[PDB]
């Protein structure tokens, strides 16, 4: 599917760079520093890529066993789940809670795996820049349908289903192929959120794919801070105020402990169109 569609003519970038692990004492220092930046920031934007779904059994693109890295060896990527059977990671559910308590303003994802939506993360605070395997859109009225199963096409093709709005418009997948321009609404919202942020945090993205990978720089260009959490080096390592080399679930569970926040239970696939009113959160530490 997705891999087969983008494999011909797309630039795959740098595959299979070595992983780096901050040793324990340095990891603990950096996650405390991340908590300080979250406490001190007014507008926090998260940027997610395929590395936040590897701990749910979905391979990334450029990691040691990524789709492209394995393709170079004539090997298929390995799934430990279907898209339908995948559960949101600790990181996915941490991001849900950060939004609920008002510590996350916006979420920009390159992931098509549908897990942010299925985690119950509100769609009005999410930009899905590369599409969502579960979402089809009416070519006529632009109404979106979030399905319980993957839409079986990619490259913005007709799925064979028709719009049911009181329309009969042709439903199409939302999965960009290499030559497709990004959805204009999602990209405009993601660009605005990134420019307005005083803190951008990237999780499990190598930031190699434009323009998605450059949005966190919009935050830096306006005087905001940039944190990169990633096992591999990334394209924009030189611009980060803070670089954390560790498993994103270990980083995010330690962060949530510092913030005094619980990672909520996942009640199975659920779609939330609009953010609910913000929940209470712990009072903030005296820093210095
Ligand atoms: N558990 C983990 N913890 C931390 N980092 C991790 C983990 N697992 C993997 N990584 C890192 O996660 C990084 C993932 O980088 P890439 O594989 O490029 O995925 P993308 O989302 O940025 O790909 C962008 C687009 O490219 C495609 O064309 C599609 O359109 C994609 O949307 C690696 O550097 C791993 O080291
Ligand atoms: N996390 C993802 O969206 C994804 C999709 C297809 C292949 N690898 C990763
Ligand atoms: Zn329609």
Curated annotation (Swiss-Prot):
Residues bearing PTM Phosphothreonine: 284
Active site, UniProt feature: 130 (proton acceptor)
Key words, A-Z: Acetylation, Acyltransferase, Chromatin regulator, Chromosome, Developmental protein, DNA damage, DNA repair, DNA-binding, Endoplasmic reticulum, Glycosyltransferase, Isopeptide bond, Metal-binding, NAD, Nucleotidyltransferase, Nucleus, Phosphoprotein, RNA-binding, Telomere, Transferase, Tumor suppressor, Ubl conjugation, Zinc
Details of cofactor binding: Binds 1 zinc ion per subunit.
Annotated Pro residues bias: 277-286
Domain Deacetylase sirtuin-type: 24-262
Impact reported for residue 10 to W: Increased protein-lysine demyristoylase activity
Effect of residue 83 to Q: Slightly reduced MDL-800 and MDL-801 compounds-binding
Claim: Phosphoprotein is one of the keywords in the record: yes
Chain residues that bind Zn(2+): 138, 141, 163, 167
Superkingdom: Eukaryota
Outcome reported for the amino acid change (mutating residue 284 to A): Does not affect ability to promote DNA repair
Protein name, UniProt field: NAD-dependent protein deacylase sirtuin-6
Gene (UniProt): SIRT6
């Amino acid at each position: 599917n997705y891999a087969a569609g983008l494999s011909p003519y797309a630039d795959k970038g740098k595959c299979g760079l070595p992983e780096i692990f901050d040793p324990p004492e340095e990891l603990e220092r950096k996650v405390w520093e991340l908590a300080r930046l979250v406490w001190q920031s007014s507008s926090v934007v998260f940027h997610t890529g395929a590395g936040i779904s590897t701990a749910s059994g979905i391979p990334d693109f450029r990691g040691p066993h990524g789709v492209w890295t394995m393709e170079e060896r004539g090997l298929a990527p390995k799934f430990d789940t279907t898209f339908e059977s995948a559960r949101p990671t600790q990181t996915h559910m941490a991001l849900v809670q950060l939004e609920r308590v008002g510590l996350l303003r916006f979420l920009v994802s390159q992931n098509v795996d549908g897990l942010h939506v299925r985690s119950g993360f509100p769609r009005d605070k999410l930009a899905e820049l590369h599409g969502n395997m579960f979402v089809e859109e009416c070519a006529k009225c632009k109404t979106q349908y979030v399905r319980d199963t993957v839409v079986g096409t990619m490259g913005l093709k007709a799925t064979g289903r028709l719009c049911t709005v009181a329309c009969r418009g042709e439903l199409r997948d939302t999965i960009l192929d290499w030559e497709d321009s990004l959805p204009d609404r999602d990209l405009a919202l993601a660009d605005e959120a990134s420019r307005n942020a005083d803190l951008s945090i990237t999780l499990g993205t190598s930031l190699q794919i434009r323009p998605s990978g450059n949005l966190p720089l919009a935050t830096k260009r306006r005087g905001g801070r940039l944190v990169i959490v990633n096992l591999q080096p990334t394209k924009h390592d030189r611009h980060a105020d803070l670089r954390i080399h560790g498993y994103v679930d270990e980083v995010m569970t330690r962060l949530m402990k510092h913030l005094g926040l619980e990672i909520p239970a996942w009640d199975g696939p659920r779609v939330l169109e609009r953010a609910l009113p913000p929940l209470p959160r712990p009072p903030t530490p005296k820093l210095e």
